[PDB]
Write a protein that holds these residues in place. Structure first.
Motif, PDB file in Angstrom:
ATOM      1  N   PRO A  88      -0.217 -37.761  -9.067  1.00 15.96           N
ATOM      2  CA  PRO A  88      -0.539 -38.346  -7.754  1.00 15.96           C
ATOM      3  C   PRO A  88      -0.589 -39.862  -7.746  1.00 15.96           C
ATOM      4  N   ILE A  89      -0.925 -40.490  -8.875  1.00 16.40           N
ATOM      5  CA  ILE A  89      -1.017 -41.943  -8.923  1.00 16.40           C
ATOM      6  C   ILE A  89       0.323 -42.600  -8.619  1.00 16.40           C
ATOM      7  N   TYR A  90       1.429 -41.884  -8.806  1.00 12.68           N
ATOM      8  CA  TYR A  90       2.747 -42.427  -8.514  1.00 12.68           C
ATOM      9  C   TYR A  90       3.258 -42.058  -7.124  1.00 12.68           C
ATOM     10  N   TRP A  91       2.476 -41.332  -6.323  1.00 10.61           N
ATOM     11  CA  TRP A  91       2.950 -40.891  -5.017  1.00 10.61           C
ATOM     12  C   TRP A  91       3.116 -42.071  -4.068  1.00 10.61           C
ATOM     13  N   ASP A  95       5.352 -39.581   0.124  1.00 11.44           N
ATOM     14  CA  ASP A  95       4.853 -38.456  -0.658  1.00 11.44           C
ATOM     15  C   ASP A  95       3.533 -37.943  -0.089  1.00 11.44           C
ATOM     16  N   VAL A  96       2.607 -38.860   0.226  1.00 14.29           N
ATOM     17  CA  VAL A  96       1.318 -38.466   0.795  1.00 14.29           C
ATOM     18  C   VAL A  96       1.516 -37.755   2.130  1.00 14.29           C
ATOM     19  N   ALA A  97       2.448 -38.244   2.951  1.00  9.83           N
ATOM     20  CA  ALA A  97       2.733 -37.575   4.215  1.00  9.83           C
ATOM     21  C   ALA A  97       3.268 -36.166   3.983  1.00  9.83           C
ATOM     22  N   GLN A  98       4.110 -35.991   2.964  1.00  9.91           N
ATOM     23  CA  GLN A  98       4.623 -34.660   2.662  1.00  9.91           C
ATOM     24  C   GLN A  98       3.512 -33.741   2.169  1.00  9.91           C
ATOM     25  N   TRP A 102       2.565 -30.085   3.851  1.00 13.66           N
ATOM     26  CA  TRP A 102       2.619 -28.897   3.006  1.00 13.66           C
ATOM     27  C   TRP A 102       1.265 -28.200   2.950  1.00 13.66           C
ATOM     28  N   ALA A 103       0.200 -28.959   2.679  1.00 18.80           N
ATOM     29  CA  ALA A 103      -1.133 -28.369   2.606  1.00 18.80           C
ATOM     30  C   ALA A 103      -1.526 -27.726   3.928  1.00 18.80           C
ATOM     31  N   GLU A 104      -1.122 -28.336   5.041  1.00 16.44           N
ATOM     32  CA  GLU A 104      -1.422 -27.782   6.357  1.00 16.44           C
ATOM     33  C   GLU A 104      -0.841 -26.379   6.509  1.00 16.44           C
ATOM     34  N   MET A 119      -1.253 -44.549   3.488  1.00 16.53           N
ATOM     35  CA  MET A 119      -1.494 -45.147   2.179  1.00 16.53           C
ATOM     36  C   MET A 119      -0.660 -44.395   1.150  1.00 16.53           C
ATOM     37  N   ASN A 120      -0.626 -44.928  -0.068  1.00 16.57           N
ATOM     38  CA  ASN A 120       0.085 -44.283  -1.159  1.00 16.57           C
ATOM     39  C   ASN A 120      -0.898 -43.548  -2.067  1.00 16.57           C
TER      40      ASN A 120
END
Length: 306
Positions: A88-91, A95-98, A102-104, A119-120
């Motif tokens: 996650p540190i490289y997202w 990526d965060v939007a995806q 997905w989680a939704e 944010m990243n």
């Protein structure tokens, strides 16, 4: 006498959003619980199993822990998208939007606006669970616990060279320059430079609620970054000590704060005792009682001793 409803006789991991709603209604009636709306657990079984007991109490203060223990007894009786298989540190922000979308779908959560986490991955790892709840009152705790599971299954931040200075020494212009870098380092929504018209010392006295008020989209990231990454918490305590005891050095306040375990009150009182004991002819314990006799006033107590 007690029997699970027919729908709920499957392992909770497979429960749908309508299954957990039936579980909630059945639990209320069976255990004479106080009513809770069906709109308090808008998630499926996969998400329900991510919740801590604290999450259950936040959602149901009267029955949350009872519901948590009930679920654990049902349990004991019983991956990621391509872009996100990265640490996650490289997202990136995309990526965060995806991850949010997905989680939704994966957990049947209420719709999650993409603007709630601009944010990243670097910034996302700085948020507290309370920051997740502030950004997503319906799914924030689920998203937080999901991120913790990703970090456990998987399997550093250096300031700029020109900005490498302790925050307590920052001028007003250094505050603005720190904001410019923070927007780029964490892919934040743009922030006006003159939102913190103050120097580093003033910046350290702002609460997280003060940061949110000035930056509704990045305040909690900026607060955690300052206070808990760039050594802002310890520097804030040194100011508080320097404001309460006249005659204390930055290096002297740092020593007392360490011996007090970060307790500013214990540090101030032990520094006041240290000054009075040197001016007195009695023991250090007699200094404690003399200051306590004068409501912890070093000027009045020193007047009595001298």
């Amino acid at each position: 006498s007690i029997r699970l409803p027919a729908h709920l006789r499957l392992q909770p991991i497979y429960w749908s959003r309508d299954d957990v709603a039936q579980w909630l209604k059945w639990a209320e009636n069976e255990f004479s619980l106080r009513p809770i709306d069906s709109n308090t657990f808008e998630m499926n079984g996969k998400a329900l199993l991510l919740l801590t007991k604290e999450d259950f109490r936040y959602r149901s203060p009267h029955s949350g822990d009872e519901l948590y223990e009930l679920l654990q007894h049902i349990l004991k009786q019983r991956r990621l998208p391509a872009h996100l298989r990265l640490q996650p540190i490289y997202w990136s922000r995309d990526d965060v939007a995806q991850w949010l979308k997905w989680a939704e779908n994966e957990f049947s959560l209420r719709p999650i606006d993409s603007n709630t986490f601009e944010m990243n991955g670097k910034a996302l790892l700085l948020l507290t669970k309370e920051d997740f709840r502030y950004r997503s009152p319906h799914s924030g705790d689920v998203l937080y616990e999901l991120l913790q599971h990703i970090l456990k299954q998987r399997p550093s931040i250096r300031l700029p060279a020109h900005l490498r200075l302790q925050p307590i020494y920052w001028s007003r212009d250094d505050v603005a320059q720190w904001l410019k870098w923070a927007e780029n380092e964490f892919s934040l929504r743009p922030i006006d430079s003159n939102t913190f018209e103050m120097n580093g010392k003033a910046l350290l006295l702002l609460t997280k609620e003060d940061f949110r008020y000035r930056s509704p989209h990045s305040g909690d990231v900026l607060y955690e970054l300052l206070q808990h990454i760039l050594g802002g918490e310890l520097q804030r305590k040194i100011m508080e000590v320097e404001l309460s005891v006249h005659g204390v050095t930055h290096q002297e306040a740092q020593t007392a704060l360490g011996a007090t375990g970060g307790d500013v009150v214990s540090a101030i009182r032990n520094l006041k005792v240290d000054q009075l004991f040197h001016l007195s002819s009695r023991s250090r314990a007699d200094a404690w009682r003399i200051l306590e006799h004068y409501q912890w006033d070093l000027s009045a107590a020193s007047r009595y001793v001298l």
